[model samples]
Target chain A: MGFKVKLEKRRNAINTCLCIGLDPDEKDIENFMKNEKENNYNNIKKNLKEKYINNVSIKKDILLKAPDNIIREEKSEEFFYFFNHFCFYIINETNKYALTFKMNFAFYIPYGSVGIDVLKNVFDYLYELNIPTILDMKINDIGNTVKNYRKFIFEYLKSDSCTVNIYMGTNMLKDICYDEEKNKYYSAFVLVKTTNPDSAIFQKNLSLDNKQAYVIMAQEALNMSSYLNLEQNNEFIGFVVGANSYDEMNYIRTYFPNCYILSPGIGAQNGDLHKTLTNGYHKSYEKILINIGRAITKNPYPQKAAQMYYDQINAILK
Target chain B: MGFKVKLEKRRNAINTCLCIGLDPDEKDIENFMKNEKENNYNNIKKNLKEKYINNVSIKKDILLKAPDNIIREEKSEEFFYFFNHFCFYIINETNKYALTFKMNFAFYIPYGSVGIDVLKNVFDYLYELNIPTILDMKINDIGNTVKNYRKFIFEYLKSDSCTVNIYMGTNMLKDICYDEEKNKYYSAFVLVKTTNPDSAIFQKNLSLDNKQAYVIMAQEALNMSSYLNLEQNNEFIGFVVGANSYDEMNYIRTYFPNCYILSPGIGAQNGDLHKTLTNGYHKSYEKILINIGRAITKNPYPQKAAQMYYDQINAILK
Candidate 1:
């Protein structure tokens, strides 16, 4: 049940090493709803009415429409219906793809109060469908604030894994990892070298000891892995190595070969996927989670584009 | 109406430079709510129902029970509620005190969707208040992301001022100041030296020219002020000089006298108030905002605590 084992199983079953980032843009959703508008509002309204007959809650009406593949004719209510529509598409299309969904935090944040409801509904549906959710919260904080963050994300949001920033140092990180309540289900991936062009400004800054800041921090976070009293079902920690930073990724892998590497910055960022896979893959051929965001999601045929990445990953990893 | 003029006006009128941060803890709220709760759940429910029926929201009911002297109850609500509550308290408490609300993005986020609602709400309230709201975003992205962040925080969030990280080079900061839409209203305070113990890890890093990283970045940000096309209402950019690091503050002030300084790390952080004002303040005495958090709200009487800081600021400034 740990992240490593579950991830390995997913890799073997799918025969691919890709993690599909489910960051659907608002414009994309609007376009999709427009295309689906041929389905009359009467039919949609009637279906919604039938679905809500037994339920008095407005939330239930929203949930019922979530799994429906049918599109509504009215564009005015698209904002309310977008989450369900996208979730339905993602669930139906990605069921057989062997890809895990990485949920970015920003997309849901802009929607305000009801956005939380939408997120919960989508994640609940995803969980029921046997899919794992990675909460892409690049959280970095110190002391008691970190403790509060851990509770908020793992306990409240119920995410399988989270992305963390290592700038705050190692002792604070050890506190979270060694927490008995969090040790079993939650997993964290520490950032090493990000895909952003300006990452080198601080990450690659050389200290008086001749070690890069991130390398020093990464080693500290990775070293604590042995101290973690992981249970059979406990999720192990991982590292985020950007596909754009192939050199840094290779350097990081050399230091910690067994560490799980989550590689992002493919497609839209113009990261060399081939170089990333060939240089970044572990000695055990333990394929990394190659995350594709806007490139795949923004595509006209998202599911097909995602499948192509799956095929490409398999070919490279094989 | 802009941040610069408003800040100047407050500094002159109050004859002091102090920003009393209202970051309230849960213990404070728990104690306050204890007396309000009836003997049983039924009574409490009945009271709450009646209160809700009479009032617009639960917040109004909570405020009704608050002490007359209490400026704001900093609860862990959606950004909208938290920001609105803080603004309301400031408006009601003392019109003379210049409102300097810190937008701790971390607190608002990690709650998933509802958090963003809180953030948007906070921004909307602040924009309407036209008071200088400092976005403590502590954002440190590189290149394009930094540019996007500037646009997002200044243009989208509509913050009067923000705190920027100095780790990223001077060139990266140019994008923010040059932003046409934000240039007129938005200003940023670059982190020169922090009050935190481990701040030296990166801040003390030496460049090829042998200058401390923070000092180098601060100088660069200040030097670029001329390039900024400031409107008639805007002021020169500022730097955050930690109350804990008096030596650095003195050094930064000597080099950039015209640059506004935001001195935090007072009270709970164990920063010396008098030493900070003595070392950080310049001839242009009307340009500083000495930030004091926890010290005020953590006290038995927050309003009295605020008054104490206000008195301390006046004594030191004179």
Candidate 2:
């Protein structure tokens, strides 16, 4: 099945549009990797000092002031090993209630190159289970670079969809969706009227054509999906509007009837489910992907939390 | 010892603005990772088919039609392990000529969680050598989510610098650079004008005030940097302009004299160097970062390639 059909099938099976987000923090380190051995950070620095302090060519003036995470990695790869394992746990647990799992690229990024395997495993497991997944990375770059990203996200991550920041405009929309093999059309959720409070800073800027940058991105989403022939029976282009901003997203969603909505800013973010459920829904209610990350994942039992969110959404739909 | 001072210090020491990108491609799989045991992709698929095909709940309808790269990952973890190793080698070898090293988050992304350790190793080693690095993630999100990204990149990845898309505008720029613990600010190379072929698609869209979106973003970079009082004697906020559009970037450069320019779109992409070299130079001749990826890495001698490019850029300076 191509993205459009596969997503539809998944949505039907789950009877909800909830997409679980995987955003981990060190505060919850013990939750995933239960058996992490203790290693002193200062000891790691001392070792680095011995290794590099003797080198006359390298600068040591900034060693103590070096970036914290890099220092942590040098001191210990344990955090990343645990993080990678944690990501898999989240993916596996969240699969029960989620129509799809959406993993933020940022969470795993701290792990760097070593964590690539962990990131891939989540995607592969999702693929193995035939669950639709989204790489919730608002990735935006130019032509060839975006091509490499396309290869990484769709090809390697095996994500059925991804969220994109269309600030660079349509050419990227055109470049990314350029692939076509087993295609009804894979999708890119172009961010418009995001859920974040400060998102209005630039996205709210008006064009000479009298369109907000967010809406302009929405229009471009419609244009690229139709022009590129990426989306067919279902639109391959979607909008990631913060669910917290119902009126704004409602306006944007109406413009993109066939386009999907990946709505973040729910649960812990204090987004109104009543408004999001009522206003943000397209005719195809399943198209609205309500994401709740911290609320569910940070809870004692993530699977139960996923089920609760799933049921609440279903209740509203009913 | 902040981003600006550190980067400038590195640039002066190396006398080059070159930053090598580590973007691996599957086209030449054997080149990066030689001596692979015969791990057939088809055989891997056959095994997956047998393992998951009998499962009742997991979706396999799209298995055969799965994204090609994930299928490739499923074949073996070798590609990622080798690719991660390749990144380190490129970093180690190219260190002599490069002022810094840059690797896109996408390149290592396919490798997943296990690859994070690989990613960490590279950063740790780079720090060991005192080479500045950039994470060209072009990351943009709202508030806390963006916070996670910053923590991952700055604190964890320990990269001295990073590239960001300013489409979300200044609040994010403020949030990212607000850290005062270092006294001097950390940095954000905001995307103003890009070098992609069709960047003008929406980036060129005129705001109601008659400013192009890219230029508007440039102005936003200035406002936020100044508002936060981050970039003074040393600039912590920069812009990423595609070298292909020199005239466009030239205008942006004028606004941000102290702000560094991480210029991409060279050699392989056929970007214009004359414009990049002449107009893009800040008061510090080394302000313009010339990123060359495949041109250097794919070569039998990446270090030599880095040296040649470095020498060529210096010649232009003379």
Candidate 3:
């Protein structure tokens, strides 16, 4: 019933260190609908009765990794249908393949009210389907605003956990750590290192004049995590260590052995799966969740890509 | 119209430094709907009637500084309707008092998909009303992803401008600045300081640290702006200097005269409006936006409060 035990149950049964990212770019959805990206299949003709998104064709490659009801053809309305259904398609298809589904908040925000509205629907669906979820948002704020995030992401959206940016440092998190009154268990995956090449712009700068911002942020959030005694009891926080840096990931583990790490930047970001698991993984197979974004989401066959990542990352444990 | 010119036009026309923040905390809205916070007036027994979020309720307190139709006798149709309508009420009321309307993005995001969906509706309304709007949200990412932010905020949402976090540093802003084939102009107010009480946990602390994170971010974003010749040419890019730090504000102004400062303090955060203006305002009185939150939004008479800020701030011009 606890979040970690629940996560571990799925991880052990599925044999996957993979966590597929659902960052649904609007134009990417448009392109995916237009057969430009995620080229799962070629176009063909069909009966003109049922309408689908933008009415390009009712004859969409239903074989394209997507939801069955996406092209109702009749109820089919505007481009939003594509955005909403594509996100749903990705979430539903991710059932057994990923240990968790990380929803990037930015992608959904652009679609406006409906974008956020549908995000909850998917999170609700994920809970019912019993898939672990992490809202991959770099969210941090003053205490007052952060409580709203805690309310929505946990109480309203019902995610298993979410990624937090430690730019404000760990002191900012005290407001959400333990709510004695309601006391529903949840966790935060603090962003230690990001995978972007330019992340060195701030996150990993360590020349004479500069130092790694991520490292400072990591130590504080982890220090807070350790102080809160979250990892020991499995009641709270974790860190998001990107695949781009194995040494950094390996270094944090030495300081705090009990802290769980969610590794992103694997497939499309060109992060190494081998180094990620070997350097960061605990011998007990309980500490890491490898995140794959474009590799799965952009692929026509998400399941195919998911299976590949699942197989390769879990091989370390085997 | 270009965002800067539109902002300046209002600055001279209205003579107000006051930018009332529309921070709609859910509980606050639930309470405001029930006449809890701000306590505008006592409820009155009216005849049974049809829904009227649109129709002005006659024979009400005309001086209450709010719309006559903020409440209804019937159960509300949706939470978003309350949010959207409430924001509209503020903007409509703001036309007389504040020079700009600042929407804190966190307040709206909690309502789920409907939250993001309704943001566009409000922005579109602001565009029509010609009220200058600053999305008081710090949004940022690397190259490819930042483009989505560019498209949504500029093209779709139609907001005059947005605030960007340069925590990643200014090198990241190249994604939003210019496009060769499709050149359109919009601006970003980079966050130099934040208004929270505990901001010293990071933003204000520097004597013993990696320097003030806020200063480093300001320099990077500003350096990018100057290199791009934004200040000289009525081009894009500004800074968000919190009301709490006037010395830093004065320091930044000494170096970069044209860089506009959207100051967030003044009222509820207990910042000095005079020092904030004198330290940062331009000779033309067009470059500083003084943001007032709780003082205006939580007041029983927001319109009355708005008039006071407008007069007091603009008095500096004399």
Candidate 4:
């Protein structure tokens, strides 16, 4: 099934717009493992032993007990194991609450060879559970290169969709947004208004044709969606509109009422759930994927945090 | 040594502005391998068998004889081997003319796990030879995420420099452009004017504060370079102005006279060598790294092509 239909079905069944972002930062993972090691080393080791029973060297005690300097310097086998299992733990715990998951490519890139394997593994697991996935790489390139990236993200990584950078133009976006040969659609959340404080330096601060660059980007997205006939069909040509900007969100909603809006920065970035959804959501479409990263994932009780955010968003939807 | 000083030393010693681009496209690799297989399969097999002597399963005949469908669909061990050796061959053949190399990250991403390893291997080899390397990912992100990407691109991949997308602004560029803690300098080629036909849609077509978006980006790059104190020091806060647009290149060159200009689209993309260097180069700071990808790499005699381009560019400088 296409990403849009799959996402709609998931959102409808779960009654939540919470997209749990699985950005496994290296230091964050290290700290998490350290805490887990200090708190319940034996239990964690026991669980890992069971999880990787067939592998003989995986349960090396030195790896789990390894200090900050060692873990920071080296990417031992256990290092990769911890990263993979950490993500698995989050996914398993928060599966019920999360209808969609977004994996930021920057977080996985540090691990290099094994990190991509971990990313693919996570995406595969998400696919197994029928959860729609977004690989938030913010990728942009010309035609052929973009095509290769599409193969890498969609085919190799098995991600349902990805967040794209629109700097190269809508023509480049067309290379990824749909598969003409396969007659299939992959949702591309084009970056219009990013969440970072400095995002405005070019996005909102720069006036383009009497409008901000983001507005021009938004208008282009609207034009792209229309050209693709996305409104008539269920295919999503979405926008990555930050949850922080209420007025901008509301204004953008009026421009393209039909396309999905992947609203990040809901928590840790200080974006409000009610305010974001109120401005971002439309009764006609109801397609805003509220993405919360550290605020949910870094919580002591991630499942509870995911549930809490899920409930809060559902309350807004109600 | 800092990337700028190292690059200058190499350019002076070699007397060439030609930056050989090592973007190994999957189809391109398959076609290259297929041609090699048809022409000198036995010789290629002999060389590979010796090179990978420790790998027992690597010499499997079935993999070597694998059909187009199999190679196209599955990323077999041989596929990775071919990619690695293809790059090694290019680097080895063109080392005399090539003082610098640029690897477009998009080509490698499709290979997933092994692709990054191949990229690292290429960079490591270049570093060993004291050659400056540019990871042309056009990367951009916030502070922390950009930090991780910096680790991936610089520390992990061992590239001296990288191309960055400046749409996220110069603040985000600050995250990757320099290393405060390390007190080290890394060259960043910020995208100003791309060569793609559709690049004009946002880059040149959209006016930002009475200037084109690319012009604003160029101005921001100038401000960023000045902020970082790049002019007095031998540090590089570069701009990526395409070789296609002479007037734009000349305009941007005037804006940041001291900074390097990574001018791509040299050949295959139909960029004039003399015109690009004439517009992009400065007498005070001869730092325009002209990147040629498919034009040279796809040539039957890449070594000859590299030398020809090197001579042409050297003639322009003279």
Candidate 5:
């Protein structure tokens, strides 16, 4: 299933347009666990052990010291419990309103082999729960190279959709859209205009066609719509418009009306939610996924914070 | 250890100026393994079972019916053995003359989780053999986000150094350099000018300081030399100059003489090796790490092909 179908299903089920971005900073996780401990030294050791176990497990053979197994088991249990608690807390709170979850791959990759393990566990858990998952891996490569990526992330990871950078040109999109022999699964969100300040330095170039490069490239991606396997009867291609770039959002929408628009940079990035939705969303309004990352994940009460965004999205869409 | 010291070590060891890139395509691997296979499928299976028992245990799971264990093992073993064979073949052949070994991260990333596992195994094997590994991942992100990447690829994957995109600005590089204290194991190859045709559109932007944005960023990364904890008299930073772009290489090298240069786009990319080495390697000759990917790996005899490049590099430098 592509992101478009997933978003539609979530919108119908939850009656909300919010896509919660789960970007957990280590500092935040550390502080959350710090207040519970009485002794600073014990707390430090506990946190370190928790991080190691959750992120990367130390082999039994590697531990030659005389530490008690009881202590080790306690540390392992605490670590797993803390990890599950955070993940469930986010899911349960967001399930009340938002239709989808966006996971930033970078945050989870640093924990070493353990990091990749946690990511798989989280993704599988979410997938089985019927929650839509979008992997925010802004992958861009050459033609044959991108095909390999499609096989790895889509066929292996089983992500509903992923973000892609169009800087390499639009011809590659055809390969991604129709790799039917492999039964490959994925919808791609192509970058049109990003919210970052330096995005304009290259994305806004005026091509010989007299169209801004991003617009030209986006139209090219849209033109390949016929190649998409619409057997599921849902749009498989989408465009990412920076929530901060209301003008570009409106511009890209004109070229791709039926296409989904994934808008990021809300909340922590100080983007105007009202303006972003008003300009980007189609007449159905539910086609837009309003992504909020730091604003919710960084909150002391993340569940409540996500609920707030859910409420805001519902109210605006209504 | 940053790229600077690694490049110096490589130069002294090989006494030549070349970083041989080994990016093998799937077709190449298949062809290499085809000769090793016997007409009987059972024979192939038996051979694979014996070779790949430790890495991948083929089980008769619901997704796949139980086939001859030997056949299953043979297929899996052939895939990875050819992969490792190609990698080591190139490295060993090149190490006889070339200075370093550069591998593109994208090639290995698409094989799913197993791809990463294979990469770790290969890198570890090569590291033990005293060969320096350069992971070509053009990683770029925000300040805090990039720090996580540093931990993931460097500290976890344990690559000697990685290629970095300079699009994110100077402050971002500063944060990456700052984190070197805790994870004192990795270095970066900041992109100055790439050989790809469309690379100039993005990398050649004018900065507020009048110099090209890439140049300014490269200089800033070079300036952070004071923060680097070098081994003995070694330097820590390096620059990636596109092998096709001699002007940019000459221009950038003039400003940062102490900085090591990583020149990619040779052979398959049609980059002129003679011009690249003449312009970029004249100062230190030992300070340059020339990257050649498809040139050698795509050939019928990869070992002999790699040796040819090694011989060519030695002839040019000597």
Candidate 6:
């Protein structure tokens, strides 16, 4: 099934708009396992150094300054086991409330091949449960390059949907958002007004034909949807307006009702869920997915945290 | 050494401003080896099906749409060997005239783990030869997420320079464009004006305080250079303006002399080298790197083609 239909079905099935972001951080694991004293950071670090240092070809000038999670793809049992177990545990604990699971490529990219393996494995596991997945890549490039990314995410990763950057223009949006062969439309959330503090520097501050940069991008999303003849029925083009920006969300919801809004920042960033949902949710399909990652996952009782957030969203909807 | 010094030194040493893009495409290999009749595309496709089908975890809905290059990474010796050989062959032949080498993450991403391995290997090989490398990722995200990307590209991949997208705002730019601990600047080319046909949709059409979107981004690059106190000395901030846009390039060159211009689209896209260099090249540092990919690599004789392109660029400079 196409991503739009799958999302609609999942949303009604779960009766929630919550999307749990499966971004793996070592600190989360460390915090969770503080009592067990089983944190294997030192072991993973040692293994990473040995493996990378032993590889004579790579320049070792900045080798000692390892990134957050450097899980090598060897006999390193502790990190991988904990990483995999931690991800699945969170899923199993919180799947009751999650309409779909989102995974950020940035988090997994640090671990190299091992990270990719874990990502594929998680997607595979998510597939078995028949849950939809979104790969948060924020990809934008030239046409040919975007084609490769389209195939990588939609075909190889088999993600039901993905996030994209719309700065490249309408041609880019047309290329990735719709599949020509199957007459199928893919779900892509174009970054509009993001949650980051400096987001306003470009997105809001800059004007495009008397409109803000984000507004222009949002309009482009709406334009592409109509141009592709995907108006109200099989909508795939969406906007990612951070939950923190209620005014922007309201404007997008009011003007572009055809686009789905994937709002991130409700949880850890402290965006008000009530106002976010009120401003973003539409009467057409009521499409607004609130993505919360560290807020729920970092809580000591993740399951309880997930349920609480789920209840809060449902209450706001009511 | 940081990327600016390395690029300047390399430019003087090579006496040319040519950056050969190492984007691996299956068509290139097929065309090159068309006479040999030894292309293993079918074998690779078969291997991909078997591997994915055997896993049984991934949804089989889109499994048959095996992307461009699904080299299954195991004993699938033919594709791996040929891919490795083709990339290295291009590099070895073109290395003398090439001021630096660039590899886009989009090209290698479709091959999955094997592609990443090849990327790491290529970086390793380039490091051994002490050739500067630019990873054309065009990455931008939230602050924390951008932090992970920074670690991946700078420390893990060990790239001398990389490309970035500036839509997330100044805070995002400030986070990635400089290194705090090292007190050393890293080289980053911010996407300003691009070669794509639809680039003008947002980049040129939008006005920020009476300035076009591209102009605003270019000004930010200059602003960043001054803010970091790296204006004329130890400069790292750069702008990526497609060679096709002469007027835009000239505007950036005139206004933001502190920034280096990484102009793509000379050969394949029919961007004029003479006009682009004239418009984009700065007098202060002669900082303009013209990137040509398929036009040179697809030629029957890459070395001769590389040398010819190098001479053409030098002639234009003179």
Off by more than 4 A, model 4: A35-76, A229-233, A276-286, B35-76, B229-233, B276-286
Clash pairs, model 1 backbone: B78-B118, B79-B118, B80-B118
Q: Chain A of candidate 3 scores what in TM-score?
A: 0.80
State candidate 6's TM-score: 0.85
| Candidate 3 lDDT by residue in tens digits, B106-167 | 77677664556556666766666677888866776656667767766777777777878656
Residue range A1-318, candidate 5, lDDT tens digits: 555666667677778768888776676556544543333333234323432223322232322122222345456444433443355456655556667788877786665444454466566656666677777766665555667767656665667777776544455565565576865535778777776666664456334245665776677666655556542645466777778877777776765676677888888887578865554555455557788988887777767888888777767765
Real contacts recovered, all predictions: 0.21, 0.66, 0.44, 0.75, 0.29, 0.79
lDDT at residue B171 of model 3 (Cα atoms): 57
Better of 1 and 4 by lDDT: 4
User: Tens-digit lDDT track for model 3 on A210-301?
Assistant: 43556566666767866775555555688887787788877788876777788877777774677744544665454687778888888888
Clashes of each: 3, 35, 14, 0, 4, 0
Best by lDDT: 4
lDDT of 2 at B191: 80
Position A57, candidate 4: lDDT: 30
Question: Residues A172-214, candidate 6, lDDT per residue (tens digit)?
Answer: 8666766687566676788998899878888887775567888
Q: Write the per-residue lDDT of candidate 4 for residues B289-312, one digit (tens) a residue.
A: 788888788998888999888887
Give the lowest summed-lDDT range of ten residues in model 4 chain A.
A51-60
**Which runs of model 2 end up more than 4 angstroms from their true locations?**
A31-97, A113-119, A178-185, A233-235, A301-308, B27-29, B32-94, B113-118, B178-185, B232-235, B280-282, B299-308
Clashing pairs in 5: B45-B70, B45-B71, B48-B73, B48-B74
Q: Compared to the true structure, candidate 3 yields what TM-score?
A: 0.83
What does candidate 1's lDDT look like per residue over A36-151, in tens digits?
A: 56443322343344322233222565545543444555344457675555544654555466457777654554444455555665666556555666766566544444665666
Label model 1 with its docking quality class.
Answer: acceptable
Higher lDDT: candidate 1 or 3? 3
lDDT of 5 at B244: 83
- Worst lDDT 10-window in candidate 6 chain B: B51-60
Residue A107's lDDT in candidate 2: 63
- lDDT for B53 in candidate 6 is 31
